Design a protein around this ligand. Structure first.
Ligand SMILES: OC[C@H]1O[C@@H](O)[C@H](O)[C@@H](O)[C@@H]1O
Ligand SMILES: OC[C@H]1O[C@@H](O)[C@H](O)[C@@H](O)[C@@H]1O
Ligand SMILES: OC[C@H]1CNC[C@@H](O)[C@@H]1O
Ligand SMILES: OC[C@H]1CNC[C@@H](O)[C@@H]1O
Lengths: 822, 822
């Protein structure tokens, strides 16, 4: 079954019923202000930081899911309905929701009134704009009253949901029925005290009335679907004191058959300078000047359209860097539109706020945001540059880092734990990807503090050496990196041994001592140690480079001497020195992570894809056979059926979910990439398809979640719910699959000195063209692809053959035509 | 005006409508297992700790409030209603809720079927029991199906509300349709790993069907009021796999005219020893032995009835220690039943969990639980004894203390601030009140650790000297004690100067240095220093005691010299040594806390009530004119209207709410007692009435909250919501009004060496009889009361005049008959 369809020329997903398996959201904004907007207008907005400047309230795990958003009640001769369907659930004659790039449109129609709302966040604005179009589609005149409705949150979302003993007495508003462009309500809780910010909610007309108190608008004993005020047909003009502030205006309209009326609502975030906080000497009345300017910038429909068109241009421009034209429309929509758009969202959000992440505990993750860079550097490299500086500034002098930082302050914290030993190497991954993309070697000279200490600055490159050295100087008895709290796998906690319930494995104190080692970090080290060595060489650091290559060689050797189980790579050595991820144990025999990542590091790669003796092939065959499902590859097999105290969080999940046998999609691209490395493009593309939204759309009732974005977790073969996703949108799966398909499958990837063109996608895509802008020049890459196992490309460039697969960067402004034969 | 009525004979509050101004709850349980139960069956249950072992889920700030709890859906002929009204909101022919002592009864009748439910927690049981009686009140046979419903919480309430990215994949149940006594569902999330406990929801019959998955029982897009399963008329027999586990059973019932059937439901908390967790070698099936036993303990109506009777007998016995019979039946019901019942609840909950406190951040407050002891020591001295040891154990070697502790673990934490300089003297308050009550001098020798440290034990008495020495050694330039983070008033943060939004004043870093002093702590030290000296004197420490009365003298003199403003006591000196609470300032001229506390401490007491030169009289008159309202006494006047950086949290509330001009009811009994001390019984009694539930029942539509219990805060005169309460139930107001009324108004108060009988209540209660069991003997105290201003008692005892107002303690088993003339 399906609940909608892609509309490629519009760059939209079209949702054709409110009755989806799960609320399906879009993200509005790409800069500093963000909205979670469901296909039923549910969700909330925040500025910079979902925990600390949340404008509007949303309830996770509500009954039913997603009753809470931007609503417009229509009262037409006493019948009340919402075009978003929820919360009133009155029958609609027509319903449709279109999720586009930075905007969505939701349309509902009932009994001769059609209400279309366009939602979006304009460029350069901290605001969410709604353009509502009301049309009489009947053959007789209509008169209705439209009540807009938003529920404010008291800024600090955690305090909002836990600290009523204080916060029910602090809610404050001002109401401006007769502003310069229409009516406005101001939410200004704590502006009396330390906050220099307030929210506005306004309409571009003089409203008949307003409401700012939730209880008065909705009524005692009532849900949002039964709200009293729209039922009464007029606003109660409530002025909140404490309790639950809201924004609501009423507008009565009269429309002849065929007539429409537009209305423009704005939810704005405003700041004032401290000296300019107040309109009056007594410090009682907020200074509204920037709110009046914001409302003036969206007083008309034309102004809305001009901003929407600018958003469209801005996206056409972002999507002009990498595109593909082939015989597979599903592939193409992923590569051209959806995966790139998701990559922008993960770049902005990290893992903080979705319909599963609550915008509370999670800030910007050190590993998470470093890997997000891999699928972002080609979109806006100047913002990737800034992000690298921000991440590296949260690293400590010893090369270890804060596991994550607060988006508002850019300062690291331990709220989700510390001492994760794979973290430091991700910084080198990010920087290597960025320099390959841009050629901005100068970033290595950027002075960058440790833990934000003014005066602690060292060149960025020097931070990378701290990362590299951290791993060098923390190896265990087999030459493999000490694991610490956990490696990439947050739930592989070998230094934990917790018997205390309800204390987080992520934050709980760890045992000093033991000998726990990670085969994954070892592989990570070989992969990114190699890049580090390259940057040292280019920095003129000959001895540092030689020394670095010797270490990489040691660790690579140790993976082969001590990290091999026979038919696959080992996962780890536990606190006691016993092997993890071996055929000698009944459960957790084979783990996916070191298979993909060791093979990507080139460890155990032999003659070619038919070399059944090469460890890499053996490892990937055991991944196919033991980990493969129709939905993707599960993390380990078998999943743990009992609590294993030496292994930490992992075995606390029921089998088939999350890190215990779930398909953790983020690591699937590693196996995809590995498969292209050994020359099995067909199987790599197969793996790509199994987890990719466009190919899974036709099973929307099994996947449940958004059919146009990747999810973190798809339940595994050992789950009752096998194939059902959780944790859509915010996942490194997006950036990693974009790396996989754009760079390894399709084969077009920047190197330091040229653009590598090395297709390995197999026979299902026999011809295609990639348009890639790199370093100011456009490469038109025409591929004729046999898909024959281990067949690798030859190139001709502008009519002349070249050797190997690297095309040196042509000068800015040129167009290079590459002709590729596989 | 009223929404119910008291039922004194039954010791109940009878709620005669679903449509109250707010949800009105009861607490069930007095030992280790507790339930919050609204008059619509809303709320939840927890074992020992509301944060860490919460069994069932509840949503604060739901729309509407309190849609969630223990529901019984009745399907009669396809018509679906709940006898709690909510969530279905069906018209009922009859509705009633009775909240009793440790139990409640909720009855709803619709279309010939009456369903009554008794909820209670049985003594000795970690369970909530519901005995349902369905009656056919029509003249023709009837049939219906009943669906029970409870929604589980995943134990850690904070994780439950914030950590879906993990916890949507962990929910686990088992279903036992054919158990020994009926059907049961087991909620066993994380029993797989660190938890040795699970929950059971069962019924004493073989249910027709069951549901454990929330989404299937309620249905997509539906609220609890629209739940699909009851409307369909048949259970879906859902077995949860993650998402949201629930307990539901269907039971088909058939009833002749006038016939009823009892059903008994049990929600239980069970643990197994680690070595008996599992029924099976493979560890997949929970050991149900304890749950079967529990369900067999409530298999019949008879067992339920016998346990309700033992609960009644337990309350009669708790309430036999202090009673009054007077001409004022509002006074009587307060003293005899409600104020004591509330005291039990505050003893058990501290300020952790109500319909306002969320059972997350607030554990067992140091200050709060010490003061709760004052109203509790006469109820169950042995439990008070143990609480003193628990509390004192969270004190540090230098006499300061953890500001609160975690109920489950008994360990201090800093989660809501540290370094509150009033905290340490409350330990003296509580121990003195306990020794006066019990004469248990030997508790002073109890060995007690510092900060639960093994081998740090010293006698309890030494803890009290560390408390006492903390103040003597932390005085500022006027000889008044340094305030630290705050004193009693959590929002007076003089070492704060915070300009950063969104960090809690309670918890934010404080400035070192400065000279900030508290007049409140000074009065506290005068009162409780004296008590300490007496304890030292009894132990024969004449050196210690002499030195101690000297310091008390120095502090008393510092209050008169540097803590007096002209017509009232100063509040504080700020960081820079500027006076706080002085007529020279425009706002916050007079603050209540030092007025009542200084006068309670005997400071500025003169010749009698008519001594117009006496500081105590001028302070109390100023309280009356400037702070007095029909609803009680506001905390300070005038309230601050702009943020005062140097005073911290206080000026951040809008005027008239909480610490900024709210009536903070906890500090009113201090003014009450001060007036008695000074000889103005009439005025003291008036203040008592203003804030007292039985006297405010007539304005239920203004108080809004429960009319049978004290609330923390009544909005003061500068608030638009003047008279509206927030934060009911959990307030030190309960202990302090009980002290005021029983010990100072009625006048019967245990001292170290005899029972003081010193009525001071004025002319509105001209005769009464108190029955006071004290040290094993019973005192029948018959008061005849002129109410003449300043007139104090003379006593005759068993026919013979005695000198003074102290009746030396008679031996255990005696009845002493005391005759009182005022
Ligand atoms: O703190 C964040 C982590 O929480 C863990 O419990 C989950 O299993 C991980 O997937 C997640 O990354
Ligand atoms: O930590 C709890 C404290 O929170 C403050 O915000 C409130 O004003 C106090 O009344 C309360 O005792
Ligand atoms: O454990 C695997 C992943 C879980 N989510 C957060 C990621 O950083 C981590 O790699
Ligand atoms: O600030 C006054 C009161 C606030 N609530 C908790 C109490 O500890 C405190 O005295």
């Amino acid at each position: 079954m399906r609940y909608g369809h892609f509309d490629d020329a519009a760059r939209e997903y079209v949702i054709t019923t409110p009755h989806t398996p799960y609320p399906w959201i879009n993200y509005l904004g790409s800069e500093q202000f963000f909205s979670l907007l469901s296909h039923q207008a549910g969700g909330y907005s925040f500025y910079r930081d979902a925990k600390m400047r949340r404008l509007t309230r949303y309830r996770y795990n509500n009954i039913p899911a997603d009753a809470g958003g931007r609503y417009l009640y229509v009262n037409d001769g006493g019948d009340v309905w919402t075009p978003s369907w929820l919360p009133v659930k009155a029958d609609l004659d027509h319903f449709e929701a279109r999720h586009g790039l930075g905007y969505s449109r939701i349309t509902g129609e009932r009994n001769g009134l059609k209400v279309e709302t366009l939602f979006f966040v304009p460029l350069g604005e901290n605001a969410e704009v709604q353009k509502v179009t009301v049309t009489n589609t009947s053959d007789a005149p209509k008169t209705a009253t439209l009540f807009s409705f938003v529920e404010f949150c008291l800024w600090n979302a955690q305090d909002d949901q836990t600290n009523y003993q204080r916060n029910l007495s602090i809610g404050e508003v001002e109401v401006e029925q007769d502003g310069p462009h229409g009516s406005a309500i101001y939410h200004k809780t704590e502006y009396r005290e330390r906050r220099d910010h307030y929210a506005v909610f306004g309409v571009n007309t003089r409203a008949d009335g307003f409401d700012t108190d939730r209880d008065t608008f909705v009524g005692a004993y009532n849900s949002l679907g039964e709200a009293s005020v729209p039922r009464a047909g007029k606003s109660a003009d409530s002025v909140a004191s404490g309790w639950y502030p809201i924004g609501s205006h009423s507008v009565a309209v009269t429309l002849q058959p065929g007539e429409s009326r537009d209305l423009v609502y704005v939810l704005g975030y405003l700041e004032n300078p401290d000296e300019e906080k107040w309109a009056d000497d007594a410090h009682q009345v907020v200074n509204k000047a920037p709110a009046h300017a914001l409302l003036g910038r969206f007083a008309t429909s034309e102004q809305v359209d001009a901003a929407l068109e600018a958003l469209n241009s801005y996206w056409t421009n972002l999507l002009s860097t990498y595109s593909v034209s082939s015989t597979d429309e599903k592939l193409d929509r992923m590569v051209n539109i959806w995966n790139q758009y998701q990559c922008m969202v993960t770049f902005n959000m990290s893992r903080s706020a979705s319909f599963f992440e609550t915008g509370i505990g999670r800030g910007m993750g050190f590993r998470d945001s470093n890997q997000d860079l891999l699928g972002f550097v080609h979109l806006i490299p100047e913002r990737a540059r800034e992000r690298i500086i921000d991440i590296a500034s949260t690293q400590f002098a010893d090369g270890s880092a804060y596991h994550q930082y607060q988006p508002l302050t850019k300062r690291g914290n331990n709220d989700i734990g510390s001492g994760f030993n794979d973290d430091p190497l991700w910084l080198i991954a990010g920087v290597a990807a960025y320099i390959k993309e841009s050629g901005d070697w100068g970033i290595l000279d950027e002075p960058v503090p440790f833990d934000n200490e003014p005066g602690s600055e060292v060149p960025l490159f020097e931070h990378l050496t701290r990362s590299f050295q951290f791993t060098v100087q923390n190896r265990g008895p087999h030459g493999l990196p000490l694991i610490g709290r956990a490696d990439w796998n947050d739930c592989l906690n070998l230094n934990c041994f917790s018997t205390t319930p309800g204390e987080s494995f992520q934050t709980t104190e760890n045992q000093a001592g033991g000998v726990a080692e990670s085969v994954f970090i070892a592989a990570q080290f070989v992969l990114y140690g190699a890049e580090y060595a390259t940057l040292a060489e280019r920095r003129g650091l000959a001895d540092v480079a030689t020394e670095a290559r010797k270490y990489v060689d040691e660790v690579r050797a140790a993976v082969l001497e001590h990290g091999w189980d026979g038919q696959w790579f080992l996962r780890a050595y536990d606190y006691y020195g016993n092997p993890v991820g071996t055929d000698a144990k009944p459960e957790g025999k084979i783990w996916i992570e070191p298979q993909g990542f060791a093979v990507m590091a080139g460890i155990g790669v032999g003659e070619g894809p038919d070399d059944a003796d090469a460890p890499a092939v053996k490892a990937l065959d055991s991944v196919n056979e033991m980990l493969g499902t129709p939905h993707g590859l599960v993390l380990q097999y078998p999943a743990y059926t009992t609590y294993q105290i030496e292994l930490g969080e992992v075995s606390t999940y029921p089998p088939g979910y999350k890190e215990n046998g779930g398909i953790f999609c983020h690591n699937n691209p590693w196996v995809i990439i590995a498969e292209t490395v050994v020359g099995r493009g067909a199987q790599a593309f197969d793996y790509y398809k199994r987890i990719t939204p466009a190919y899974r759309e036709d099973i929307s009732d099994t996947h449940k979640l958004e059919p146009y974005v990747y999810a973190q977790m798809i339940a595994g073969k050992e789950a009752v719910r096998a194939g059902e996703a959780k944790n859509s949108w915010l996942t490194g799966t997006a950036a990693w699959n974009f790396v996989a398909v754009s760079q390894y499958l399709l084969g077009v990837r920047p190197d330091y000195d040229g653009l590598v063109v090395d297709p390995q996608i197999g026979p299902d895509v026999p011809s295609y063209t990639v348009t890639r802008v790199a370093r100011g020049a456009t490469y038109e890459i025409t591929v004729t692809n046999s898909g024959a196992p281990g067949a690798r490309a030859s190139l001709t460039v502008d009519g002349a053959p070249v050797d190997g697969r690297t095309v040196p960067y042509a000068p800015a402004g040129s167009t290079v035509r590459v002709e590729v034969t596989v």
